Design a protein around this ligand. Structure first.
Ligand SMILES: *Cc1cc2c(nc3c(=O)[nH]c(=O)nc-3n2C[C@H](O)[C@H](O)[C@H](O)COP(=O)(O)OP(=O)(O)OC[C@H]2O[C@@H](n3cnc4c(N)ncnc43)[C@H](O)[C@@H]2O)c(*)c1C
Ligand SMILES: *[C@@H]1O[C@H](CO)[C@@H](O[C@@H]2O[C@H](CO)[C@@H](O)[C@H](O)[C@H]2NC(C)=O)[C@H](O)[C@H]1NC(C)=O
Ligand SMILES: *[C@@H]1O[C@H](CO)[C@@H](O[C@@H]2O[C@H](CO)[C@@H](O)[C@H](O)[C@H]2NC(C)=O)[C@H](O)[C@H]1NC(C)=O
Ligand SMILES: O[C@@H]1[C@@H](O)[C@H](O[C@@H]2CO[C@@H](O)[C@H](O)[C@H]2O)OC[C@H]1O
Ligand SMILES: O[C@@H]1[C@@H](O)[C@H](O[C@@H]2CO[C@@H](O)[C@H](O)[C@H]2O)OC[C@H]1O
Ligand SMILES: O[C@@H]1[C@@H](O)[C@H](O[C@@H]2CO[C@@H](O)[C@H](O)[C@H]2O)OC[C@H]1O
Ligand SMILES: O[C@@H]1[C@@H](O)[C@H](O[C@@H]2CO[C@@H](O)[C@H](O)[C@H]2O)OC[C@H]1O
Ligand SMILES: *[C@@H]1O[C@H](CO)[C@@H](O)[C@H](O)[C@H]1NC(C)=O
Ligand SMILES: *[C@@H]1O[C@H](CO)[C@@H](O)[C@H](O)[C@H]1NC(C)=O
Ligand SMILES: *[C@@H]1O[C@H](CO)[C@@H](O)[C@H](O)[C@H]1NC(C)=O
Length: 473
């Protein structure tokens, strides 16, 4: 087709439809949501990215970058058939400057590869998610929360500059001192404004020891969930969680526990966690001290860490939702608990819920000021918890299945004003319509996002079904 001929004349490397690599390059992370691209460009340099983008514009097709391919809605594939996919995973180099400790990171580098290189070359790190296969591109441009985030913030907070290919093929560098509107827009909503062709990340010195630990929670009936969560949120909101502690609740039908990573040794952790243990009447278990990389591996849930192979093919079949909330009133705690116990525990599919200890007085995430970036959830009281709800099938996903997580999310949102909750596009939920998605993902920052969108991509070349809409002028 025309897109194929344009890419060829422009000397852009591609994955041919009839090749062996098509299957790998086109395949989603979420097997529930395959899409068939118009074509797959396979850039080795920013020049190829520019030329691919220009081809999409000249020919009249939409284009989307795919970095790690982990979008829960397959938005890296375009979220529908027939987009040019700019597959970035042949571009994964990570360079660490010994002087400034700034990392130059190509946009197809996956988190495990990044973590490995930064640690091996200078014992450095930045704050990012668990999950070695996740691409830096989607992850860092929309937030990025992991077991260093209470201590050090979101992945997006470590970006110091980015080189961007715009919808008309122009190159720009965005930073605090250059294209500041674009830099603001990238840092929360970056899928909408161009293809980032190179990132520069600041780093921190990796702690020599981290300590993983667990606290089992007796959340086997509704009253125990309510009292336990009510205590936990009061503890967090009143500054109980020290900077060095990073923690979440992981629940499934068969066990509920706090899981943590403490940036320090085991004796220091025991001292730091004692107040919470006394409040919950609970005990520590599985206390394990690690070096920095073993700490990462511990929560990776993956055999491979330093992943760079273009053959990468990890995939699951699922539906997922997210939330960001304040502390929850007990009426909401009761509804959420009843749903958990009476409904979720009886669902005959693998599911889990993660409640990250996200905000409160000591969180680095919510110390970032309200105007710093488009990422919407920075209030240390109002943005207290971040949630992942995940519903996974081993066969085909049942078409009536969506009601399960939908009902659970309703148990929260029915009792919270829209100023006290949002959603998180790193757990992209294609059940939301486009208007709803923009509002819940970006909240108070949507209007300015829409204005920048009209300025930078008025034709919506980077369209996907939950993309920011350009403002009308
Ligand atoms: C599969 C998976 C996802 C995880 C895991 N663990 C996480 C964690 O511990 N914390 C988190 O905050 N998130 C976790 N996630 C979710 C991922 O963070 C999100 O799913 C990321 O958005 C995935 O990023 P990536 O792998 O790059 O996904 P893509 O599908 O390629 O892209 C998503 C989105 O971003 C746009 N995009 C990619 N690359 C670019 C560039 N270079 N420029 C602009 N826009 C870009 C895509 O077009 C698409 O819209 C653990 C697991 C197992
Ligand atoms: C990423 O880094 C490596 C260097 O480690 C680059 O490797 C060079 O690749 C070119 C061909 O592209 C060869 O001529 C050189 O011999 C390679 N050098 C080494 C040391 O192997 C690679 O090109 C870079 N990749 C990207 C996508 O930029
Ligand atoms: C490519 O798009 C960019 C961004 O929209 C254009 O740059 C803008 O041009 C307008 C009009 O001249 C200026 O007022 C803006 O300040 C520019 N923005 C930036 C970020 O520099 C650019 O003109 C476009 N190029 C072409 C050929 O269409
Ligand atoms: O087997 C499950 C893991 O696959 C799951 O992995 C989670 C993926 O989403 C990320 O945001 C989480 O950090 C990560 O733990 O963890 C739970 C486990 O049951
Ligand atoms: O910051 C808050 C602390 O003040 C609180 O500490 C407890 C206060 O009550 C006393 O009985 C206990 O000795 C002490 O641990 O813990 C919660 C935290 O958010
Ligand atoms: O394409 C999928 C949609 O069909 C799905 O829509 C949901 C179906 O079940 C209804 O009860 C829900 O209200 C509705 O949102 O959402 C997921 C998407 O991938
Ligand atoms: O005005 C914009 C429309 O042009 C855009 O239409 C999309 C174009 O790509 C097609 O594959 C989609 O199906 C179609 O919806 O929709 C968004 C709107 O802002
Ligand atoms: C603490 O860190 C060092 C390297 O920083 C590591 O080799 C050692 O095994 C760690 N200690 C424990 C108890 O795991
Ligand atoms: C919930 O379970 C606990 C045991 O952990 C029990 O003491 C309590 O009475 C139970 N409450 C109800 C209402 O079933
Ligand atoms: C644990 O950490 C503290 C500082 O937080 C340090 O003084 C102490 O020596 C450490 N313990 C061990 C066994 O290294």
């Amino acid at each position: 087709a025309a897109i194929d001929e344009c890419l060829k004349n422009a000397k852009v490397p591609v994955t041919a439809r009839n090749s062996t690599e098509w299957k790998t390059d086109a395949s989603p992370f979420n097997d529930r949501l395959p899409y068939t691209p118009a074509a797959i460009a396979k850039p080795a340099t920013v020049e190829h990215i520019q030329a691919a983008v220009l081809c999409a514009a000249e020919v009249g097709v939409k284009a989307n970058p795919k970095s790690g391919g982990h979008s829960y809605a397959s938005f890296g594939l375009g979220g529908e058939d027939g987009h040019l996919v700019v597959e970035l995973d042949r571009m994964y180099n990570v360079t660490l400057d010994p002087e400034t400790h700034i990392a130059t990171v190509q946009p197809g580098a996956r988190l495990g590869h990044i973590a490995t290189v930064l640690y091996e070359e200078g014992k450095r790190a930045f704050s990012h998610g668990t999950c070695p296969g996740v691409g830096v591109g989607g992850h860092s441009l929309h937030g990025g929360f992991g077991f260093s985030s209470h201590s050090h913030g979101l992945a997006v907070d470590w970006i110091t500059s980015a080189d961007v290919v715009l919808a008309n093929g122009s190159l720009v560098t965005a930073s605090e001192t250059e294209n500041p509107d674009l830099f603001w827009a990238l840092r929360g909503a970056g899928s909408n404004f161009g293809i980032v062709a190179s990132f520069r990340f600041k780093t921190f010195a990796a702690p020599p020891n981290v300590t993983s630990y667990e606290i089992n929670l007796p959340w086997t009936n509704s009253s125990n969930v309510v009292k336990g969560w009510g205590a936990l949120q009061e503890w967090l909101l009143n500054g109980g969680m020290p900077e060095e502690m990073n923690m979440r609740v992981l629940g499934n039908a068969f066990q509920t526990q706090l899981q943590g990573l403490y940036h320090g040794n085991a004796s220091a952790l025991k001292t730091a966690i004692q107040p919470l243990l006394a409040l919950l009447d609970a005990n520590l278990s599985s206390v394990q001290e690690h070096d920095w990389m073993e700490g990462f591996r511990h929560y990776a849930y993956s055999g491979e860490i330093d992943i760079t192979d273009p053959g990468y093919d990890q995939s699951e079949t699922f539906y997922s939702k997210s939330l960001v909330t304040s502390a929850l009133p007990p009426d909401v705690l009761e509804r959420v608990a009843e749903y958990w116990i009476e409904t979720a525990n009886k669902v005959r599919r693998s599911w889990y819920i993660i409640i990250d200890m996200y905000g409160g007085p000591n969180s680095a995430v919510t110390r970032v000021p309200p105007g710093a970036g488009s990422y919407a959830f920075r209030d240390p009281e109002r943005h207290l918890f971040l949630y992942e709800l995940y519903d996974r099938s081993f066969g085909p996903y049942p078409d009536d299945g969506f009601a399960f997580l939908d009902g659970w999310v309703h148990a929260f949102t029915g009792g919270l004003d829209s100023s006290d909750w949002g959603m998180y596009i790193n757990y992209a939920d294609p059940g939301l319509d486009r208007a709803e998605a923009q509002e819940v993902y970006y909240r108070q920052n949507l209007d300015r996002l829409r204005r920048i969108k009209q300025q930078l991509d008025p034709t919506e070349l980077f369209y996907y079904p939950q993309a920011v809409e350009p403002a009308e002028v």
